[PDB]
C-alpha cells in the first residue's frame, strides 16, 4: 500500500541476524524502526537479570516508537531479533516532518500503539486474575495465533521452549513442564521436543 | 512558573467538542460498548478499571485534567471499549465523534501527536505494571505503588515526606491484593519506619 511504500522510501533498511539486540533498554531514543521482514521479542528484566517477554512483534510492526513524542526519552525495553530480520529505520526528526506532510503514516503507527495498549492491558488482567494453568493455557492460544504458527491436522503447531513459555507467563521452567504434562494428559495439546500442538485452534 | 501560555491547538480542538459534566462516581465509559467517541478531561480525575469474572477490580490507571480517554477504538471501526472509566471527582469532559476527530487530524496532526504521546506513556506504565505483577510479591508491589503514588503531581508535600490520599481497598485494586492484605502490609511498612498509615511516605 502506497502510504507504507512512501514511508519506506524515506528509510534505510538494515539486516540483523537472529539473536541480535536491536534496542537496549535505557538508551537515549532518537530513531523509529519498522519491521520489513522477520520477528522480534520485546523483553524486560528484574534486578537479577531474569527476563520476561512483554511482546512479540512481526513483519509490518513499528518498533522504538515510545520515544518519539517527548524529547529526552529513553528506550523502555530490550528488543531482540528472534529470526533474521530486515528493519527499516528513520530519525524521529525526519519522521516528524513526514507526519506533517501526510498524517496517514501517523495513523498507521498510532493504530499499532492503541492495539499494544489493549493487548498489554489484557496481559495485566491475565497476571492479576488467572492462575499459572490459566496463563499458560491463554499463552498457548496466543502463540497459536502468531504469524509463524503452522497448521496441523489436530490444530496449530508452535515451536517454543519451556523456558520461553515461562518468561511469557511468569513461571519457572519446572512449573511450565508440570502444567504442560497436565494439559497433555487432558488431551488439550501434544508435545514433541520444542514442538507443541495446540488442539482446536 | 506562573501564568498559562495560550494553547491554540487545544483551543481549536475543544471548539469542535461538546462539554459534559459528570458527578463523582459516575461511569464515563462502559466496558464492552461500541466505541465511536473520543473524550478529553477538561477538569477532574478518573480511574480506568478492568474486572474479572467474579467482579474483582484492577485499576490500570488514574487519568486527570488534560488526558484523552476512550481513544483506543479510534483507529479501526467496530471495536469495543477495552476497560471501564469511572469519575473519582466531579469531571468536565469534552467529547467528539471519532468521525469528526479523524477529520481534525488531517487539518492539524499535532492533535494526534498529543493523543499518541499519551498512549505511549500509558504503554510504558502498563508494561511496568506487567513486570511488577510478574516479578514482585505483594509487599514488593505495595512498596512500589506507594513510591509511585508519592511521585504523582497530586501527591502533597508533608513535613515528613510526601502524603497521598488513598484507601486500602484502592491499593488492593492496583496491586491485586485484598484490602485486609494491604492493611497488614502497610502496618509492616510502618513498623519498618518507611511510612505512616491518608498515608505519608517518608523522605527528606
Ligand atoms: N508492552 C509492549 N508491547 C509491544 N511493544 C512494546 C511494549 N513495550 C515496549 N515495546 C516496544 O519496545 C520498544 C523499546 O523502545 P521504545 O521504548 O522506544 O519503544 C518500545 C516499543 O516499540
Ligand atoms: N492500560 C491503560 N492505561 C491507561 N488508560 C487505559 C488503559 N487501558 C484502557 N485505558 C483507557 O480506558 C478506555 C476504555 O475505552 P477505550 O478502549 O475506547 O479507551 C481506553 C483508554 O482511554
Ligand atoms: N488477585 C486478587 N486478589 C484479591 N483481590 C483483588 C485481586 N485482584 C484485584 N483485586 C481487587 O482488589 C480489591 C481490594 O479491595 P477489596 O478487598 O474490597 O476487593 C479487592 C478486589 O476488587
Residue numbers in the entry:
A (entry chain E): 9 to 209
B (entry chain A): 3 to 199, 203 to 209
Sentences from the study reporting this entry:
Interestingly, although V140A protein showed no global change in structure, there is, in this mutation, a significant local conformational change evident in the crystal structure where the mutated V140A residue formed a new hydrophobic contact with the rotated side chain of C179 that is not present in the wild-type or V140L proteins.
CAP is a 210-amino-acid transcription factor that binds cAMP generated by adenylyl cyclase in response to the phosphorylated form of Enzyme IIAGlc (phosphorylated in response to the phosphoenolpyruvate-carbohydrate phosphotransferase system). cAMP-bound CAP regulates the transcription of over 100 genes crucial for carbon utilization through its binding to a specific promoter region and recruitment of RNA polymerase. Previous studies of the ligand binding domain of CAP demonstrated negative cooperativity between cAMP binding sites in the absence of structural change within this domain.
